[model samples]
Target: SFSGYLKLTDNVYIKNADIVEEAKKVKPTVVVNAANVYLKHGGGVAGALNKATNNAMQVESDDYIATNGPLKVGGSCVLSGHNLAKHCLHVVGPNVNKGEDIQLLKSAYENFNQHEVLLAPLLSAGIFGADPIHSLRVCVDTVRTNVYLAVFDKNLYDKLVSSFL
Candidate 1:
């Protein structure tokens, strides 16, 4: 909480966060796959969802995206400021954990509404919570889009721009 943008490196246990655990945490009613829902920080006015994953499922050439498999089917919606989040809402991707950043980017292209926005969270899997400020900035740099996103780092406010053509 010492930067321009909102961030969460002080408290938030992501050590044992898994599909089931996350689902139970951010109990979302409907969890789709292959969608560029983007990710968010786990702190601030409310926290974000689980870690940002890239693994997605392309439903069709022009349709909504959904998870491939091993996703959590929540009974409720895990809002940002519900259980343990400062931001209020945490949204993380699934494939990001594997190695599908680009694929995610590609999938986003097929969206019918090009106006859709994709925001990424700083709590992505790779970030082990070191140099919280710096790391968060670097990861936030990966999100490619032109829209509003709830970021957790100070630098995010500045980098929240369209990186693609």
Candidate 2:
């Protein structure tokens, strides 16, 4: 529930807050979903977002995959955000167990360039096992848009705060 922020550039910033809550309150142009290639809203940030939208987002995700096929590790797709925001961008990050690649993570974040206000999670830092700091660094470096990072863990939040200094 705690919040903090670091200005990255002229109009770019990284905020520590709850993405699910902020997406509803701030209604950013798009909220980034740290999704699996299959776009399954099983758990983590994806699960929370799905729950917030009453599984409507999941239905959209299912339909997207049904027609478009599985999303690549570095690829992304957009879907209706329902009541959360105008749109949702689903970006699949590289799983460390599957062959960790920083470039793939960067590419995942690089997709945010087109968005102006973005609410995102630290992709691949959860069950995917990518280093949180490294993931955060890639996201901060690759994404040029104004970003709000949902960091629920205080420990990770502290680490991220220090990294900005």
Candidate 3:
């Protein structure tokens, strides 16, 4: 039990894509997975022909923003009417599209921390693709690498660990 790896003996097997369901199976204080967060892409084309009379009420495939959270793109990512994420994260990748992504991520996390919104629980629901499993894989794999969690508070960090137990 003290080893770094976890073990499961129950008949209830936790599938990779079914993160939330797996969490529910344990019925623990809290279940945290590195995967499961989803973001929305306003399904509007960038540089659309309709500039003067464009819809601002919702995000279209062409709608893109420099910094929503941990996502930054030179072009716009497709958004359906609007991309409703728990929070829109604008992050800078290994590209010039974002001038200073590192600083921005730090600032964003700091802002979220100050408001007590650090650490998020996501699952297959957030992602959209051909199927739920595919969507889950795409969302989880990408998020695991891009996100950076700051373990600043020693006590809170401990609490986080305990909840997983």
Candidate 4:
């Protein structure tokens, strides 16, 4: 497993590790789900979290969308953590292929400020096509609290390490 960390500011610090495994070990106050607007925990970070929680996360997300409707890009919804963390924060990030502004990715990170200890994946970097560096920068800039960033790609992890070093 690759691991790295950096202190960006007095209030903000980031650590990179396996998100699912780290969540199990650290038990952060909240775990972030890189979700679709529909809150479908189908694949990527969402699917991993859902599997970790034995599909309880998916059920909760579906119920949330059913009652509240699909979330907009840059919007968020929170659900009770089903044995993963204290809560799960689902954030909808913009798909760059759709010509959505990258700024919406910033908004997704902004939503995380409300939580103290957060475990998050690199949002919008997977099928959404947002640059990983840009996503990491936004996350570093916006979330003014200790955070763990789960990174699975070794090449990307090296880049992330070099960026801060």
For each candidate, give its TM-score against the true structure.
0.26, 0.90, 0.21, 0.89
Per-residue lDDT for 87-132 in model 2, tens only?
9999889888778675698888888888877778888888778988
lDDT of 3 by residue, 1-165 (tens): 011212121211122222222222333222222211122323211111112114431232223433443233211122222112222222111121223222222222222222222122222122111222332233333332222222223453344335432
Worst 10 residues of 2 by lDDT: 1-10
Model 4 lDDT tens row, 44-87: 88888889999988888788888989999998888887787888
Ranking of predictions according to lDDT: 2, 4, 1, 3
Backbone clashes, each candidate: 45, 0, 26, 0
In the predicted model 4, the residue pairs found to clash are none
Kindly indicate the candidate among 1 and 3 with the higher TM-score: 1
lDDT of 1 by residue, 39-103 (tens): 22233211223233211111121122223222221111122322222222223333344553423
The residue pairs in collision within model 2 are: none
Off by over 4 Å in 3: 1-61, 64-86, 91-105, 118-165
Write down the worst ten-residue block by lDDT for model 4: 1-10
Best by lDDT: 2
Give the distance in Å from residue 138's predicted Cα in candidate 3 to where it truly belongs.
26
Clash count (model 3, backbone only): 26
